[PDB]
C-alpha cells in the first residue's frame, strides 16, 4: 500500500543523519535511502506498539 | 515534511487494526486517521532506534 | 521458564520508579509486580532486537 | 541487584537463537552467554520504555 507520513523537522534531520552515518560506515550512496530507513523506523514503532 | 512511503500489507493491516481498536474504545472517526496513526508510529520508531 | 539475573543498580531503580508511578495511578497486584514488569521489559527488548534480524 | 523473572518458552528459545546468531556473526564461545544477552535485552526494553514516554 502507499501512504503519506507527516514527520517533524527533527525526525527529518535525524533520518538524514542515520543515512549519512551508514555512508561514513561504508554504505554506497545508492545502497541506502530515506524511504527504506523510514520503513525500518515505522516497523520499529509498530513492534513497540504491539508490545 | 511529507514522506510518501510504500508499506507492506502486514503494516497496512496492523495500522488498520489499531485504528479499529481505538474506534471500539470510543474514538470518533473524525479524530482518527491512517496518516496520523502511521506518522506517530514513525516518530516513536525513531526514538526507539535512538535507544538502541 | 524461571530466570535469575543480576541487573545494574540503575536499571533496578528505574523499574522501581515505573512500579511506583503505576501505584500512584491506582494499579495493584500484577500491575505493580517487579518481576512481572521486568519480564515485560525483557520481552519488549526482544521484540525490538528482532526487527534487525 | 538480583531479579527473578518468568519468561515464556518462546522467549527463552528466542534468546538461544540470538546466542547462536552472535557466535556466527563475529563473537566467541563463553561470551554471549544467556544471562548477558537477557540482561542486555532487559536494559534495552527499559530504554525503549523510556522512549514511549
From Swiss-Prot, chains C, D:
Cellular localisation: Cytoplasm
Induction: Regulates its own expression from two promoters, requires TraY as well as expression of the tra operon for maximal transcription. TraM is in a monocistonic operon.
Effects seen without this gene: Loss of conjugative DNA transfer.
Record's function text: Conjugative DNA transfer (CDT) is the unidirectional transfer of ssDNA plasmid from a donor to a recipient cell. It is the central mechanism by which antibiotic resistance and virulence factors are propagated in bacterial populations. Part of the relaxosome, which facilitates a site- and strand-specific cut in the origin of transfer by TraI, at the nic site. Cooperatively binds 3 regions in the F plasmid oriT locus; 2 are required for autoregulation while the other is required for plasmid transfer. Bends oriT DNA less than 50 degrees. Plasmid specificity is conferred by the TraD-TraM pair.
UniProt subunit comment: Homotetramer. 2 homotetramers cooperatively bind to DNA although they do not contact each other; cooperativity is achieved by DNA kinking and unwinding. Part of the relaxosome, a complex composed of plasmid encoded TraI, TraM, TraY and host-encoded IHF which binds to the F plasmid origin of transfer (oriT) in a site- and sequence-specific manner. Interacts with TraD. Also interacts with TraY.
Similarity comment text for this entry: Belongs to the relaxosome TraM family.
Protein name (record): Relaxosome protein TraM
Annotated source species: Escherichia coli (strain K12)
Encoding gene per record: traM
